Each structure stands twice: as structure tokens, then as C-alpha cells.
Write an enzyme that holds these catalytic residues in place. Sequence first.
Site, PDB file in Angstrom:
ATOM      1  N   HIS A   1      59.541  89.849  92.103  1.00  0.00           N
ATOM      2  CA  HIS A   1      58.185  90.163  92.811  1.00  0.00           C
ATOM      3  C   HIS A   1      57.514  91.002  92.103  1.00  0.00           C
ATOM      4  O   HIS A   1      56.170  91.321  92.165  1.00  0.00           O
ATOM      5  CB  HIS A   1      58.273  90.217  94.301  1.00  0.00           C
TER       6      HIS A   1
ATOM      7  N   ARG B   1      65.406  89.760  94.162  1.00  0.00           N
ATOM      8  CA  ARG B   1      64.013  89.126  94.778  1.00  0.00           C
ATOM      9  C   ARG B   1      62.807  90.204  94.398  1.00  0.00           C
ATOM     10  O   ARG B   1      61.749  90.124  93.969  1.00  0.00           O
ATOM     11  CB  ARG B   1      63.854  88.591  96.032  1.00  0.00           C
TER      12      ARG B   1
ATOM     13  N   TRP C   1      70.453  78.230 100.457  1.00  0.00           N
ATOM     14  CA  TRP C   1      70.286  77.020  99.655  1.00  0.00           C
ATOM     15  C   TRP C   1      71.578  76.437  99.134  1.00  0.00           C
ATOM     16  O   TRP C   1      71.807  75.423  98.370  1.00  0.00           O
ATOM     17  CB  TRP C   1      69.486  77.441  98.308  1.00  0.00           C
TER      18      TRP C   1
ATOM     19  N   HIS D   1      67.647  81.142  93.114  1.00  0.00           N
ATOM     20  CA  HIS D   1      67.663  80.550  94.513  1.00  0.00           C
ATOM     21  C   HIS D   1      68.948  80.107  94.968  1.00  0.00           C
ATOM     22  O   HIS D   1      68.976  79.669  96.213  1.00  0.00           O
ATOM     23  CB  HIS D   1      66.461  79.417  94.715  1.00  0.00           C
TER      24      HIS D   1
HETATM   25  C1  HEM Z   1      57.728  78.756  92.173  1.00  0.00           C
HETATM   26  C2  HEM Z   1      58.410  80.028  92.552  1.00  0.00           C
HETATM   27  C3  HEM Z   1      59.125  80.283  93.541  1.00  0.00           C
HETATM   28  C4  HEM Z   1      58.885  80.441  95.181  1.00  0.00           C
HETATM   29  C5  HEM Z   1      57.494  79.583  95.581  1.00  0.00           C
HETATM   30  C6  HEM Z   1      59.722  81.253  95.607  1.00  0.00           C
HETATM   31  C7  HEM Z   1      59.894  81.351  96.968  1.00  0.00           C
HETATM   32  C8  HEM Z   1      60.777  82.053  97.650  1.00  0.00           C
HETATM   33  C9  HEM Z   1      60.880  81.993  99.177  1.00  0.00           C
HETATM   34  C10 HEM Z   1      59.878  81.301 100.234  1.00  0.00           C
HETATM   35  C11 HEM Z   1      61.746  82.717  99.678  1.00  0.00           C
HETATM   36  C12 HEM Z   1      62.285  83.172 100.865  1.00  0.00           C
HETATM   37  C13 HEM Z   1      61.839  84.634 101.111  1.00  0.00           C
HETATM   38  C14 HEM Z   1      62.083  84.884 102.613  1.00  0.00           C
HETATM   39  O1  HEM Z   1      62.200  84.017 103.683  1.00  0.00           O
HETATM   40  O2  HEM Z   1      63.108  86.026 102.859  1.00  0.00           O
HETATM   41  C15 HEM Z   1      62.462  83.281  98.355  1.00  0.00           C
HETATM   42  C16 HEM Z   1      63.602  83.870  98.163  1.00  0.00           C
HETATM   43  C17 HEM Z   1      64.201  84.443  97.028  1.00  0.00           C
HETATM   44  N1  HEM Z   1      63.950  84.072  95.987  1.00  0.00           N
HETATM   45 FE1  HEM Z   1      62.265  82.914  95.211  1.00  0.00          FE
HETATM   46  N2  HEM Z   1      60.570  81.627  94.770  1.00  0.00           N
HETATM   47  C18 HEM Z   1      60.223  81.352  93.701  1.00  0.00           C
HETATM   48  C19 HEM Z   1      60.788  81.932  92.325  1.00  0.00           C
HETATM   49  C20 HEM Z   1      61.993  82.759  92.457  1.00  0.00           C
HETATM   50  C21 HEM Z   1      62.471  83.511  91.239  1.00  0.00           C
HETATM   51  C22 HEM Z   1      61.928  83.312  89.527  1.00  0.00           C
HETATM   52  C23 HEM Z   1      63.131  84.296  91.409  1.00  0.00           C
HETATM   53  C24 HEM Z   1      64.099  85.366  90.602  1.00  0.00           C
HETATM   54  C25 HEM Z   1      64.465  85.060  89.511  1.00  0.00           C
HETATM   55  C26 HEM Z   1      63.593  84.331  92.894  1.00  0.00           C
HETATM   56  C27 HEM Z   1      64.634  85.021  93.676  1.00  0.00           C
HETATM   57  C28 HEM Z   1      64.734  84.518  94.967  1.00  0.00           C
HETATM   58  C29 HEM Z   1      65.696  85.218  95.711  1.00  0.00           C
HETATM   59  C30 HEM Z   1      67.083  85.958  95.120  1.00  0.00           C
HETATM   60  C31 HEM Z   1      65.561  85.112  97.228  1.00  0.00           C
HETATM   61  C32 HEM Z   1      66.392  85.587  98.197  1.00  0.00           C
HETATM   62  C33 HEM Z   1      66.100  86.708  98.860  1.00  0.00           C
HETATM   63  C34 HEM Z   1      66.716  86.957 100.118  1.00  0.00           C
HETATM   64  O3  HEM Z   1      67.630  86.520 100.516  1.00  0.00           O
HETATM   65  O4  HEM Z   1      66.329  88.137 100.677  1.00  0.00           O
HETATM   66  N3  HEM Z   1      62.585  83.318  93.199  1.00  0.00           N
HETATM   67  N4  HEM Z   1      61.920  82.510  97.536  1.00  0.00           N
END
Ligand code: HEM
Length: 293
Positions: free
Chosen positions: A51, A47, A190, A174
Site C-alpha cells: 500500500h 500489505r 483465503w 493473498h
Molecule cells: C485488486 C487488488 C487488491 C485488492 C482489492 C486488495 C484487497 C485486499 C483487502 C480488502 C484486504 C483485507 C484488508 C483487511 O480487512 O484487513 C487485503 C488484504 C491483504 N492484501 Fe490485498 N488487495 C489487492 C492486492 C494486493 C496485493 C497486490 C498485495 C501485495 C502483493 C496484497 C497483499 C495483501 C495482504 C498480505 C493482505 C492481508 C493483510 C492482513 O492479513 O493484515 N494485496 N487485500
Amino acid sequence: KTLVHVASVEKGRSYEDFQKVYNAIALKLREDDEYDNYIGYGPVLVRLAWHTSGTWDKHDNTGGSYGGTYRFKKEFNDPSNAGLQNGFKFLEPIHKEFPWISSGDLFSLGGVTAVQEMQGPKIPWRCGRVDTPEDTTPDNGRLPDADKDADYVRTFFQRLNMNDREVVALMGAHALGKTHLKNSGYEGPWGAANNVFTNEFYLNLLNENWKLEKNDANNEQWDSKSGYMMLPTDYSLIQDPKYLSIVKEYANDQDKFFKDFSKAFEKLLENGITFPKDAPSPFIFKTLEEQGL
Ligand code: HEM
């Protein structure tokens, strides 16, 4: 177009140097396994890579991975980046051991290393991001909202030069990690395999029985009896007929997802950067497992 960022190789460095940095990241990933209730740092590093890259704007080449600007407080403290401080903290000892690597190279290499060590696809990676000063830090607000629909998602990602297939492939990350209520206002993993890179996200979207519920922050998310969740933007991939076809493809073809993810993730990590015609070829790092380490 406009603002040009030319990749400049860290002086005298070659593949072996970066494989050493890879390896240090990969060894720390193995060592610090208790993080986040034993999920480990893989997901938050992925992530962080996204970002720090995902602030890019194709119209004027602002933001993007090149400048490493997450190290400056405006970007570090973006509400959208809540939680990523854990990723940065992880990488601090790596950067201290290898102070010659740029911040943008480190944050993006962290993500490649994580995906590969979690048994995901190889991700070719190129060096040469160069730190840029604090005043190049993009304002908050460039990262996507989670409460919206497929039209939002499609339009959002046009700014990053991603098409429908690239968007759905990238969202497959995700599978990893979880939402944390205190960071984002969403809670839950997820899927079951959330520190091994697989196509589980697509299978779960299609096969779980989802219910639209309110979480304890009073935000809607889709929940399944198995204990899994999907954000509204995740669920929009099966509401829109164009996204749905692609979700189905990846749910039925692990290799295809791996190859499309590898391409999109490298692109995401390289958006905004001009590589000179004579730059080194992209590097494909060996995993620890492949090295017997
Ligand atoms: C419409 C696009 C996206 C939205 C709205 C989004 C939203 C989110 C949100 C709300 C979370 C949880 C953050 C937390 O509470 O700790 C999350 C986690 C995460 N996202 Fe996204 N995301 C999107 C796109 C992507 C993309 C493109 C990637 C990378 C290719 C990504 C990888 C992840 C990963 C790896 C996590 C888990 C991080 C954790 O476990 O610490 N996301 N995402």
C-alpha cells in the site's frame, strides 16, 4: 516521466547495515507471534509494503514508495489503509533502533523481510528512498476497490505499469493473512497456510467450491465450506480467460510463481525511483534461518 526521484544511499551504509535492519525486523516477527490470533505480523507487513508503494501513478510519478509518505496523517488515515497501523506500530521500535534508515526504505524492507521469513522467494531490494515532505503525500483513493471485476483490475494495475502476469503473480500474496470485517468490510482467510508464503491462493481459487455469499457487512464475497474466502477481485482472476490461464500456471508451478512474484514485488517496490548508474546492486538478504539466528 516528469517528477524525478533519485535513489540516494543512506550516508556510508552498505549491505551489512541493511542486513542488520532485516534481522531486527525478522527477530521481532518471530517474537511477536501472537498478533492477529497467532497469524503474526508477516502478512500486514507485506500489505504495508504494497500500500505504501501502490499509490504510485506512472503518468506523473506522484505517490510511490520513495517518499515514505504513509507517516503523514492523510495517507495513514486513508480508509483503504485501515489495519496498516498495526504494521507501522510494529516498525516503530525498528526505526528507533535504526533511525538512519528512510521511512520508504523501512516500509518496503519490512515487506521483503516478511515474505522471506515466511519462506517465500528471495526478493532483491535496493536502498535509497528519501523522505519527502507532507505536501507530497498522495490523496486517498489510489488503492484498489475489492468489489469489482477483471476489467477493473486490469485497468487499475495499468496505472502501476503491471501487465496481466504481474497482476496475477502479485495477487498470490493473498495467500497471506486475512480480511478483517472492521477494516475492509470483508471477513475471512483465503486459505490454511496464511503465514507461510506458498502458491495456495491459486490452488484454492481453482479447487475449492466457491459460493457467492453476503457477509455481515452486507458485502458479497466468495466463500468455501473449508472456511476460506475470495474477494470479488480475487475471483475475477478465474472469470477472465486471460487471468485464468495464468492462475492455472502458478497453481501448477510453485517455482515459477516464486520467481514471477519476486520480480513483480521488487518492481512494485521500486516504481518511481531512478537508480543512478553507479548505485549499489540490489541486495539479497539472508534469512535468520540461513544465518543460524
Ligand atoms: C485488486 C487488488 C487488491 C485488492 C482489492 C486488495 C484487497 C485486499 C483487502 C480488502 C484486504 C483485507 C484488508 C483487511 O480487512 O484487513 C487485503 C488484504 C491483504 N492484501 Fe490485498 N488487495 C489487492 C492486492 C494486493 C496485493 C497486490 C498485495 C501485495 C502483493 C496484497 C497483499 C495483501 C495482504 C498480505 C493482505 C492481508 C493483510 C492482513 O492479513 O493484515 N494485496 N487485500
